[PDB]
Amino acid sequence: MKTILSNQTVDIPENVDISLKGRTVIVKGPRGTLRRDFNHINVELSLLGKKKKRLRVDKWWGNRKELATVRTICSHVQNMIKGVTLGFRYKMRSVYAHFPINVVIQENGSLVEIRNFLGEKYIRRVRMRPGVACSVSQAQKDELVLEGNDIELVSNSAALIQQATTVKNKDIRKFLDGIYVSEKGTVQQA
């Protein structure tokens, strides 16, 4: 049946200041600004209390299928707040069997010249997402640090260079090659 009320309060800190207008909020803090629209889910927001200490969300008279979509938006908001305050640092390494994968960055952290992928003369130019700053760091064999604000953009920039290495219609059990994500965390320590 239609459950009348299922609230979920969010205890935002003082450094994260928001100001809602309908279903569009703005998030500021130490670094990075992120905006996202919330017109599609059609819920009610309530920013209560003096000096804006906590947020409240409502979903009036929704069934079992519609109440399941309420908790995940809170997780997306918490991931956005974590990306504004701390950030997202994705570290990942390269795996090769015989032919090494020549990885170098071009156009100030927005293009990767992938060369010599398992003896193939074809090259790839996987462009990064806008906002994500790739950096090939030192003291390792292959180490590409990805840094940015939004979790969707950073994970998409990770997924493009992760699944760019595809072997077309061969034995993936024997051919074990590809660049994959190993480490995930934040930019600054909490």
Binding site: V95, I172, L176, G178, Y180, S182
Partner: protein
């Protein structure tokens, strides 16, 4: 010729997946049913034959 930890990391994403019987869909190995309409959510699964 290859690092064993990075080899198992490559096994985690690609190879270690359950395979459906009817439609042979690639599924995560913590599933009870399939995720395809073409099979009809077949509960019967099989582990992928690993390399020896």
């Amino acid at each position: 010729i290859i690092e064993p930890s990075l080899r198992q990391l490559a096994q985690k994403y690609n190879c270690d997946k359950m395979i459906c019987r009817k439609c042979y869909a690639r599924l995560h190995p913590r599933a009870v049913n399939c995720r395809k309409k073409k099979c009809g959510h077949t509960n019967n699964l099989r582990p992928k034959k690993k390399v020896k």
